[PDB]
Curated annotation (Swiss-Prot), chains B, I:
This is V-type proton ATPase 16 kDa proteolipid subunit c. The lineage of its organism: Eukaryota, Metazoa, Chordata, Craniata, Vertebrata. The record marks E134 as: Essential for proton translocation. Residues 29-50, 110-126 are cytoplasmic. The gene is Atp6v0c. Belongs to the V-ATPase proteolipid subunit family.
From Swiss-Prot, chain C:
Belongs to the V-ATPase 116 kDa subunit family. Subunit of the V0 complex of vacuolar(H+)-ATPase (V-ATPase), a multisubunit enzyme composed of a peripheral complex (V1) that hydrolyzes ATP and a membrane integral complex (V0) that translocates protons. V-ATPase is responsible for the acidification of various organelles, such as lysosomes, endosomes, the trans-Golgi network, and secretory granules, including synaptic vesicles. In certain cell types, can be exported to the plasma membrane, where it is involved in the acidification of the extracellular environment. Required for assembly and activity of the vacuolar ATPase. The gene is Atp6v0a1. It is found in: Cytoplasmic vesicle, Clathrin-coated vesicle membrane; Cytoplasmic vesicle, Secretory vesicle, Synaptic vesicle membrane; Melanosome. This is V-type proton ATPase 116 kDa subunit a 1. The chain holds residues 3 to 99 of 839 of the full protein. Disruption phenotype: Embryonic lethal. Knockout embryos die at 5 to 6 dpc, before gastrulation. It comes from Mus musculus. Predominantly expressed in neurons in the cortex and in the dentate gyrus, CA1 and CA3 regions of the hippocampus (at protein level). Expressed at lower levels in astrocytes, oligodendrocytes and microglia (at protein level). In the cerebellum, present in Purkinje and granule cells (at protein level).
UniProtKB/Swiss-Prot annotation, chain D:
It is an enzyme of class 3 (hydrolase). GO terms for cellular component: clathrin-coated vesicle membrane; endomembrane system; vacuolar proton-transporting V-type ATPase, V0 domain. Its EC number is 3.1.-.-. One of its GO terms (biological process) is proton transmembrane transport. Coiled coil: none annotated. Keywords: Cytoplasmic vesicle, Endocytosis, Endonuclease, Hydrogen ion transport, Hydrolase, Ion transport, Membrane, Nuclease, Transmembrane, Transmembrane helix, Transport. GO terms for molecular function: RNA endonuclease activity. The chain crosses the membrane at residues 8-28, 60-80. InterPro entries: Ribonucl_Kappa (IPR056552), RNase_K (IPR026770). This is Ribonuclease kappa. The gene is Rnasek. Belongs to the RNase K family. Endoribonuclease which preferentially cleaves ApU and ApG phosphodiester bonds. Hydrolyzes UpU bonds at a lower rate. Regulates the activity of vacuolar (H+)-ATPase (V-ATPase) which is responsible for acidifying and maintaining the pH of intracellular compartments. Required at an early stage of receptor-mediated endocytosis. Its main location: membrane.
Curated annotation (Swiss-Prot), chain E:
Residues 24-40 are cytoplasmic. Disulfide bonds: none annotated. It comes from Mus musculus. It comes from the Eukaryota. The chain crosses the membrane at residues 3-23. This is Renin receptor cytoplasmic fragment.
Length: 77, 150, 97, 85, 40, 50, 45, 279, 150
């Protein structure tokens, strides 16, 4: 799979809703409230997902599986 | 050439976990029960409001059950003995930790129901203390899982 | 920017008693005035308007008796709304008598 | 009957359980060799490749769907009974 | 040879440790309850 | 009966607010020290003049 | 009955205790009195 | 500074990372919707059950918690204790016998054989989105998710703690506090950063610095970090992370030690100085 | 050689360690919670003053979790019976240190919440004695870590 493209897609989308959104928000009483609300949500989700992806890069030790699943995977994967 | 009496410690842990958990659940539930009985005769309104800790007390027994079931699933005739003492330690430990958790839950529940039977604005704080105390059972189960899988 | 406590100030409101009988009502409609006991050393009973307050307590007692009487007899209350329907006369005394 | 409020609780219970059983049956219609552990077999499927491995998932999904249908029938009964009063 | 030595040392140490554990358990079990105890 | 309740209760509340008062030597007017937002003082004085 | 209700309440209170103990202790401090303006908000009282 | 909106999001998100569940989150959102559509009809119902009343006062918190729990639960790949093969497995371990290199000894022997990602053609890279679903059978999933959640909690807590402490700049400037910033606040950040910024960057570096072809001589998960805490310089088992790591940590330790006197030896002597100048 | 019977020190060490941490935390929680529930009926607004020792009561459990997880990571049979001793001893050390801490925390909580009835000042000395007992517990974890890491 691609190693930097989907990461860039996700980063671009979250950054867009982060920095282009606040000016799109009406200048009302709930402007700054909703701006920091969405910014915090976006950065929290971005940190979470980034660690999720980057944890699985360049693994060291490998996993295990049973023999019946080996046969059943050979005939169905 | 397999070690002799290798599977003994796994079953002994499976037993010890649940027995100690049940012991502490019994003591704590009994203490909270006598407290809520006295404070229902003194205050016959907020009984089912303060029965929630009584119901909550058996999650320690549930933790002991989960550990025992895991030990049983990993238990067989062909035990290498490198899982026997992991199982003994895990079961003994979760059992005793649950035992202390149940006893402290009983004490705090009795004191709290007696405090709130007349002026119950502190119910939120009392459930706060109780649920803070609850962490020991989860600690027991988690360390047991780490040891068994090891 | 950020959120902080709203700005506040002290104020000495000069107010005749008759003007007070409506100023209190409107400051209650507004709901934005915090008061303070200017002479707290005086006892509550040495505030010599407890005759009216005791009268009010009697009014509450009578209305509570009416409430229980209707509840036993199963007589409902309309309870539509219109919360701000609030005069401040002296004829209410005779009305509740 | 069976309690008015308890019947309200029952209709909500069915309102969730029906969709839970629907999802269970949906995944028991996918059956991409995932829940092997949920198969009552003894070396019956190791021969002739991966055949006969799908119909039993369809039977489990049939059980889920008949359970969901019974729940919806009981929900209709409770609907009629809450509209009775 | 050190089957017996290890057995004996483990026995002594476990006995001492268990006594420590149970004396602490007894200490925590039976101390006073902190209640005013005015309204009987 | 409900509106009678709310009238009587509010009037009790008015008497409670009137308990907090400047006990002056001779003034028939009163000078009350009150905390109030600076934000709404325009509506405050509009209400007072009303 | 279990993994929704009691686990959710437990995690709720655990996270709330963490938040109060740490986040507010880092910068939030001091004591004060809440503004209680006389009002007719006691519509039913 | 009332931090209320910051709490409004940081508490649901933290509760959701704790509470990584999909079904329960949708259940909470459903209950919140039932309470929203019938807000006035439940207000007409008396709030006798006080638990239910404080639940009503926490309707919006519960809805936020449910939505964040839905998101988090979706991304763990733990939806009712199952993993989903949404994308391809991204591993492409097609051959049975080769890539494992055994003959036919299965069932009667050769039951469980550890794949190595170092082997060619067995690892096509990380999963596109969410946890790797193949772990639904791997027993080493438990150790690897243990490490994952450990690193995850450490990073989240470190960053949130840093922001919470950092918010005091405005508290200081608004109330003209040079004493509580010059030798106060800033040394606190220096100490905390010198301790934990290094940890987070080591964890990130570990995530990609070494691969399966270096696994059997690669470092452990966290032991060498504790070894840094030991004031120790081993000579065995050193698969040192990068050039000059020892030199950097040696001086980072002293930098962290340099923050002891602050908050303790700057307020009194300065205020006594200004006091004696004020007499 | 590697004699039979190698793998019992660390496993029982972690078991006993967390058992004793649970004992201490449970006792402290029970006693301090009883004291708080009994005191708070008179002067309600000190829930926020009394919650501090409750929160500090979890340091023993945190320490036990950290050290137990470390020992579990370092548990293995690829050593000739050197480091297993260290694991048993470190587990017992942190566990009995946790018992010490829990006893001190419980009685300190009772003392502070008894003395808080009249004087508002006592929370400062309360936090101070809490910091002291926390220093003791931190010493305990530090000795456990230097043993276990070695």
């Amino acid at each position: 799979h691609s190693f930097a493209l989907p990461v860039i897609i996700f980063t671009t989308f979250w950054g867009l809703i982060g920095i282009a959104g606040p000016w799109f928000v009406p200048k009302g009483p709930n402007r700054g409230v909703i701006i920091t609300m969405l910014v915090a949500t976006a950065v929290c989700c971005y940190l979470f997902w980034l660690i999720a992806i980057l944890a699985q890069l360049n693994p060291l030790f490998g996993p295990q599986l049973k023999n019946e699943t080996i046969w059943y995977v050979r005939f169905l994967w | 050439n397999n070690p002799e009496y290798s599977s003994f410690f796994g079953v002994m842990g499976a037993s010890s976990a649940m027995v100690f958990s049940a012991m502490g659940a019994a003591y704590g539930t009994a203490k909270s029960g006598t407290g809520i009985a006295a404070m229902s005769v003194m205050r016959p309104e907020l009984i089912m409001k303060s029965i929630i800790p009584v119901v909550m007390a058996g999650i320690i027994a549930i933790y002991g059950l989960v550990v025992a079931v895991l030990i049983a699933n990993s238990l067989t005739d062909g035990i290498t003995l490198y899982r026997s003492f992991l199982q003994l330690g895990a079961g003994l430990s979760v059992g005793l930790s649950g035992l202390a958790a149940g006893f402290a839950i009983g004490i705090v529940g009795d004191a709290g129901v007696r405090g709130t039977a007349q002026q119950p604005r502190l119910f939120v704080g009392m459930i706060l203390i109780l649920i803070f105390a609850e962490v020991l059972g989860l600690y027991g189960l988690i360390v047991a899982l780490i040891l068994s899988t090891k | 920017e950020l959120f902080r406590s709203e700005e506040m100030t002290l104020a000495q409101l000069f107010l005749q008693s008759e003007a007070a009988y409506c100023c209190v009502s409107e400051l209650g409609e507004l709901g934005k005035v915090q008061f303070r006991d200017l002479n707290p050393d005086v006892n509550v009973f040495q505030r010599k308007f407890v005759n009216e307050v005791r009268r009010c307590e009697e009014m509450d007692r009578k209305l509570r008796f009416v409430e229980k009487e209707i509840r036993k007899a199963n007589i409902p209350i309309m309870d539509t709304g219109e919360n701000p329907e609030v005069p401040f006369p002296r004829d209410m005394i005779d009305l509740e008598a | 009957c069976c309690g008015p409020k308890l019947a309200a609780c029952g209709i909500v219970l069915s309102a969730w359980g029906v969709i839970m059983l629907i999802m269970l049956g949906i995944f028991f219609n996918v059956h991409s060799a995932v829940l092997i552990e949920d198969v009552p077999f003894t070396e019956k499927d190791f021969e002739n490749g991966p055949q006969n491995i799908y119909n039993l998932y369809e039977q489990v999904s049939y059980n889920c769907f008949i359970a969901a249908g019974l729940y919806l029938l009981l929900g209709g009964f409770s609907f009629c009974q809450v509209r009775l009063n | 040879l050190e089957y017996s030595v290890v057995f004996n040392l483990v026995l002594w140490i476990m006995i001492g440790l268990a006594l420590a554990v149970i004396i602490t358990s007894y200490n925590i079990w039976n101390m006073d309850p902190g209640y005013d105890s005015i309204i009987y | 009966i409900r509106v009678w309740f709310i009238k009587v209760r509010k009037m009790k509340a008015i008497y409670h607010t009137l308990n907090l008062c400047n006990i002056d030597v001779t003034q028939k007017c009163l000078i009350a020290e009150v905390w109030c937002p600076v934000t709404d003082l325009d509506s405050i004085q509009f209400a007072l003049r009303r | 009955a279990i993994l929704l209700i009691m686990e959710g309440l437990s995690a709720f209170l655990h996270a709330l205790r963490l938040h109060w103990v740490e986040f507010q202790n880092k910068f939030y401090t001091g004591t004060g009195f809440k503004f209680l303006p006389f009002s007719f908000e006691h519509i039913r009282e | 500074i009332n931090p209320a909106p910051y709490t409004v999001i940081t508490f649901p998100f933290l509760f959701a990372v704790m509470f990584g569940d999909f079904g329960h989150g949708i259940l909470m959102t459903l209950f919140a919707v039932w309470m929203v559509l019938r807000e006035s009809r439940i207000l007409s119902q008396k709030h006798e059950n006080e638990m239910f009343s404080m639940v009503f006062s926490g309707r919006y918190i519960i809805l936020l918690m449910g939505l964040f729990s839905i998101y988090t639960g979706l991304i763990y790949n733990d939806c009712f204790s199952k993993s989903l093969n949404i994308f391809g497995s991204s591993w492409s371990v097609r051959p049975m016998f080769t890539q494992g290199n055994w003959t036919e000894e299965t069932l009667l022997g050769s039951s469980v054989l550890q794949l190595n990602p170092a082997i060619p053609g067995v690892f096509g890279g990380p999963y596109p989105f969410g946890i790797d679903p193949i772990w639904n059978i791997a027993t080493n999933k438990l150790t690897f998710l243990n490490s994952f959640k450990m690193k995850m909690s450490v990073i989240l807590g470190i960053i949130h703690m840093l922001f919470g402490v950092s918010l005091s700049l405005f508290n200081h400037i608004y109330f003209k506090k040079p004493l509580n910033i010059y030798f106060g606040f800033i040394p606190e950040i220096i100490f905390m950063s010198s301790l934990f910024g290094y940890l987070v960057i080591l964890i990130f570096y570990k995530w990609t610095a070494y691969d399966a072809h270096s696994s059997r001589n690669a470092p452990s998960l966290l032991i060498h970090f504790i070894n840094m805490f030991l004031f120790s310089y081993p000579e065995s088992g050193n698969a040192m992370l990068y050039s000059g790591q020892k030199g950097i940590q040696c001086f980072l330790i002293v930098v962290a030690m340099l923050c002891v006197p602050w908050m303790l030896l700057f307020k009194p002597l300065i205020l006594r100085h200004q006091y004696l100048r004020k007499k």
